[PDB]
Amino acid sequence: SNAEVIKELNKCREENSMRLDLSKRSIHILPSSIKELTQLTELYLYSNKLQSLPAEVGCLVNLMTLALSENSLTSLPDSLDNLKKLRMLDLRHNKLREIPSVVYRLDSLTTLYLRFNRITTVEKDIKNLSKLSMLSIRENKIKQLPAEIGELCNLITLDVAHNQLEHLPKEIGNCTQITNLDLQHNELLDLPDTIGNLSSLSRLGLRYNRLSAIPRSLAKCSALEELNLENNNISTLPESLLSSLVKLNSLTLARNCFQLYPVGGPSQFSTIYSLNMEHNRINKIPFGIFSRAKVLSKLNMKDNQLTSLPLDFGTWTSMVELNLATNQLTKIPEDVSGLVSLEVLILSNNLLKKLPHGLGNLRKLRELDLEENKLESLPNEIAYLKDLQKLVLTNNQLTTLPRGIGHLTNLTHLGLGENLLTHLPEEIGTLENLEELYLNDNPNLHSLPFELALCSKLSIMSIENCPLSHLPPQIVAGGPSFIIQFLKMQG
Amino acid sequence: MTEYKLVVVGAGGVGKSALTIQLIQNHFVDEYDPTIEDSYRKQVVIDGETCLLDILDTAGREEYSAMRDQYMRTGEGFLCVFAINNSKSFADINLYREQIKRVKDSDDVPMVLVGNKCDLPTRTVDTKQAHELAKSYGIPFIETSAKTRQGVEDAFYTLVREIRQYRM
Numbered sequence A: 001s002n003a004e005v006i007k008e009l010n011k012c013r014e015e016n017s018m019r020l021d022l023s024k025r026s027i028h029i030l031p032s033s034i035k036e037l038t039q040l041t042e043l044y045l046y047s048n049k050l051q052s053l054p055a056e057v058g059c060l061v062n063l064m065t066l067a068l069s070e071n072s073l074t075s076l077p078d079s080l081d082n083l084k085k086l087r088m089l090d091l092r093h094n095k096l097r098e099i100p101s102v103v104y105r106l107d108s109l110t111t112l113y114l115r116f117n118r119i120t121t122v123e124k125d126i127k128n129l130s131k132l133s134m135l136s137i138r139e140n141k142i143k144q145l146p147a148e149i150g151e152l153c154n155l156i157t158l159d160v161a162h163n164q165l166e167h168l169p170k171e172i173g174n175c176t177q178i179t180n181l182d183l184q185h186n187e188l189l190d191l192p193d194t195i196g197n198l199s200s201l202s203r204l205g206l207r208y209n210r211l212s213a214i215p216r217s218l219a220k221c222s223a224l225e226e227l228n229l230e231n232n233n234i235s236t237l238p239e240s241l242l243s244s245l246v247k248l249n250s251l252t253l254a255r256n257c258f259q260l261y262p263v264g265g266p267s268q269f270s271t272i273y274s275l276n277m278e279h280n281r282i283n284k285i286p287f288g289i290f291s292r293a294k295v296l297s298k299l300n301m302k303d304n305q306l307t308s309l310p311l312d313f314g315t316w317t318s319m320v321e322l323n324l325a326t327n328q329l330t331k332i333p334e335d336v337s338g339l340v341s342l343e344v345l346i347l348s349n350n351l352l353k354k355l356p357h358g359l360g361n362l363r364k365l366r367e368l369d370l371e372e373n374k375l376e377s378l379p380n381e382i383a384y385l386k387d388l389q390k391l392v393l394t395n396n397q398l399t400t401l402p403r404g405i406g407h408l409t410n411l412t413h414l415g416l417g418e419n420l421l422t423h424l425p426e427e428i429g430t431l432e433n434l435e436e437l438y439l440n441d442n443p444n445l446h447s448l449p450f451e452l453a454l455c456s457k458l459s460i461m462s463i464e465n466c467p468l469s470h471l472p473p474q475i476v477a478g479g480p481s482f483i484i485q486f487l488k489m490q491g
Numbered sequence B: 001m002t003e004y005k006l007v008v009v010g011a012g013g014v015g016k017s018a019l020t021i022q023l024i025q026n027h028f029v030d031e032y033d034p035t036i037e038d039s040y041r042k043q044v045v046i047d048g049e050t051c052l053l054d055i056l057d058t059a060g061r062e063e064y065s066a067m068r069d070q071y072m073r074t075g076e077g078f079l080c081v082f083a084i085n086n087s088k089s090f091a092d093i094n095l096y097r098e099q100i101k102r103v104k105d106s107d108d109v110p111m112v113l114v115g116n117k118c119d120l121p122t123r124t125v126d127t128k129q130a131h132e133l134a135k136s137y138g139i140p141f142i143e144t145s146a147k148t149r150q151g152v153e154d155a156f157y158t159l160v161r162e163i164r165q166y167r168m
């Protein structure tokens, strides 16, 4: 309340402390008596309800830190020029429609947070704040940056994410000290070629824009650890780009216009641990494209045009997680038995009629999703997937499960919904760790195996739209626990 | 009810935000968004006590790390975090402890050394070094993984126990 506000001001000048903390006190109007506290070097006023600052704050000439985050300020007093020693200015989470004119005059600033405001203009006077090392105008309404952005030659981070930039001024290549350039969630149509001057650039946020190409000069930013171009209008990558980024950990070309794999050969994937290409129009994975990708452990080809797999797809031995969902795959080759390090295999929404017998060789497989295929039968070799925990077979043509399904001693999730299924095997009782069994939408399931009660941890189960006519109508009308106790009786 | 003011310090990219959100929201954040500051209040029951955890998630990158002294000044316990695949972050551990000891102006400050990203197959920091380093400080050391949630509750709860020893 206000009782502590005015009294702790006298408490500050009596103690003659060089730091005042009036945060989270729901303060609405800072009293003018703060002019007496000229010994202050830090003033923390964050998480309050201020809508303006008193002119008397301009008396604190020795201020070096002014924290004004989470308020409702719309401007700042023009008397703040007298703060000729101010270093960091935290104004994020406020209500500013433009940078206050006094901030363009605080040439001693090294840190300026303008995140989460309604700012629309970055004036050319921004060049006066050339001692800045951190400029964050994230989450605003800025549609253009002036060319004077190139005179902030001490910038390490330029955060302009979540704005409305259509172009980056080419003068950005003069902020050589930049290691972090975040341009994500804008409307960029292209990138300046001078981006290759930022040789210390290690992190570059480009996702969610409107880019149609990547400048070839980006190959000079050989410190990049991640190239994430998600949600754009890109179809190719320039020559020798991926091979030049010798420190790339992951590549993400998802949601673009890639109809083919980027040119460069196998020598362009020799450094990534991950590769996401989901939501594109790639019609084929090149033969031998991963003959040099020895650390690539994650591949995502979801939502594409793949109708078949390359012949050497079985040599992808370092692959741990593989996602081939939403394609037109009509067959999984027997060469899949070579992916012995695979732990997650997603094949949902394809045209799979059956699965190869080499599938049982995936000793490390932990999660197998085959939802929305044309599966007429399961291969008997699923019994040898000792490490499988999640099996999703929802929406298929399965009428029977192989009796060896009980060898899945670590299976915890089994989704058999929207299938035909005349019955479950009696070997279902050896599934010790089974916890979820979805059987809904099985019009031919008129019975449930009595050995199902041996599954102790079976808590979740759905049986809606299942006849279960061999079981009493009163038992099936209840729910899961009703049939849970019923199977324990007869056994 | 009782509250515990916790501060998470460590180099940028070690997993300070993933550890906090894993404990607070029970899910692993995959993206990397550098932190300026983030504060959370989460009720929990530790060793039978219903208490309120006040977690302060600070910056690791230096340009983001303006006002780091003030955040450390209000905290009661500190999670000093490093990534086991980043030897630079483990070397910086001694810098964060000395910065804490000077802003709190105290020799004994409730503190826990945390080694994150243990789910990763290959590491570059020797677990023998971290046990030895934490032993010389008088504080515990805990291997964690924000992806698999391994040791996440252990880390924050051990820090709370260290604050109890201070008050009691």
Ligand SMILES: Nc1nc2c(ncn2[C@@H]2O[C@H](COP(=O)(O)OP(=O)(O)OP(=O)(O)O)[C@@H](O)[C@H]2O)c(=O)[nH]1
Residues within 6 Å of the ligand: B010, B011, B012, B013, B014, B015, B016, B017, B018, B019, B029, B030, B031, B032, B033, B034, B035, B036, B058, B059, B060, B061, B116, B117, B118, B119, B120, B144, B145, B146, B147, B148
């Ligand atoms: N494999 C693995 N990755 C992790 C783990 N914890 C965090 N990460 C990843 O590491 C990156 C760093 O995550 P953050 O929690 O944001 O790191 P930070 O300490 O907050 O970084 P700053 O905000 O700059 O201080 C993220 O992209 C995470 O996905 C983990 O326990 N295991």
Ligand SMILES: [Mg+2]
Residues within 6 Å of the ligand: B016, B017, B033, B034, B035, B057, B058, B059, B060
């Ligand atoms: Mg963080």
